[PDB]
């Protein structure tokens, strides 16, 4: 039954039916047991595609809203609000799965860092659509989760580890886009890159392609943001 839901989610992935995939992986997580690496990635892939659609739509609609400064604006605004509602419910869905199930059962250091990066990501997506009243506290929940993940990652993972690098990349984007700090975003990205490139002998064939890909993305962001 757990294997059955996992195989259906893999099938939904190939079919590009991410609502279905998410439902499958959600109910796997709700069974209580710790997820394997395969399962972990299916859960995140599923939920990432489901929110992404809303983020992309939200941005397009916000953009339309801004360059109609009259009645067209009320329509856009209302449609944006419909989209934000959808987005929040998806973000709260994952965060409930992280609080109630995934973070508590994380026995390995890499599971713990992975789920805290997720927690950071989904509070960041809530920050993207939050107003001043609630935003301050949403941002701090994201930062707190990222920082804890970053500290554990610094202690217990090698600099080339794909999860450390991917954490650096996302925490950097948090600094740049959410906290309007180009310099803090740039040093995070630069440190992760420089440390990984110094220890390039440490890469496994199991994840050399992941690690090198993420390194390129770090440096791409760095190159853009200092120019």
């Amino acid at each position: 039954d757990k294997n059955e839901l996992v195989q259906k989610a893999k099938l939904a992935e190939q079919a590009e039916r991410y609502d279905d995939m998410a439902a499958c992986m959600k109910s796997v997580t709700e069974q209580g047991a710790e997820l394997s690496n395969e399962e972990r990635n299916l859960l995140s892939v599923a939920y990432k595609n489901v929110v992404g659609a809303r983020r992309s739509s939200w941005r397009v609609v916000s953009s339309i809203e801004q360059k109609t400064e009259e009645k067209k604006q009320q329509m856009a605004r209302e449609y944006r609000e419909k989209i934000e509602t959808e987005l929040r419910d998806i973000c709260n869905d994952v965060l409930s799965l992280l609080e109630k199930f995934l973070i508590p059962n994380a026995s390995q250091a890499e599971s713990k860092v992975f789920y805290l990066k997720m927690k950071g990501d989904y509070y960041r997506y809530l920050a993207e659509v939050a107003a001043g009243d609630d935003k301050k506290g949403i941002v701090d929940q994201s930062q707190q989760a990222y920082q804890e993940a970053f500290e554990i990652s610094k202690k217990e993972m090698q600099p080339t580890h794909p999860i450390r690098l991917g954490l650096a990349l996302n925490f950097s984007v948090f600094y740049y886009e959410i906290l309007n700090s180009p310099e803090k975003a740039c040093s995070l990205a630069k440190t992760a890159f420089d440390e990984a490139i110094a220890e390039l002998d440490t890469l496994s064939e199991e994840s050399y392609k992941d690690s090198t890909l993420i390194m390129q993305l770090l440096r791409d962001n760095l190159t853009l943001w200092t120019s």
């Binding site: 992935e13 190939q14 995140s44 892939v45 990432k48 595609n49 992404g52 983020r55 992309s56 941005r59 397009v60 916000s62 953009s63 339309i64 990501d121 991917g166 990349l169 996302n170 984007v173 886009e177 392609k209 992941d210 890909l213 993420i214 993305l217 791409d220 962001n221 853009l224």
Partner: peptide, 17 residues
């Protein structure tokens, strides 16, 4: 930062059968 701007974070990438 336009309406078609992607935040350059971790992509859901390097998947295969």
């Amino acid at each position: 930062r336009s309406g078609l701007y992607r935040s350059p974070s971790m992509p859901e990438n390097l998947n295969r059968p």
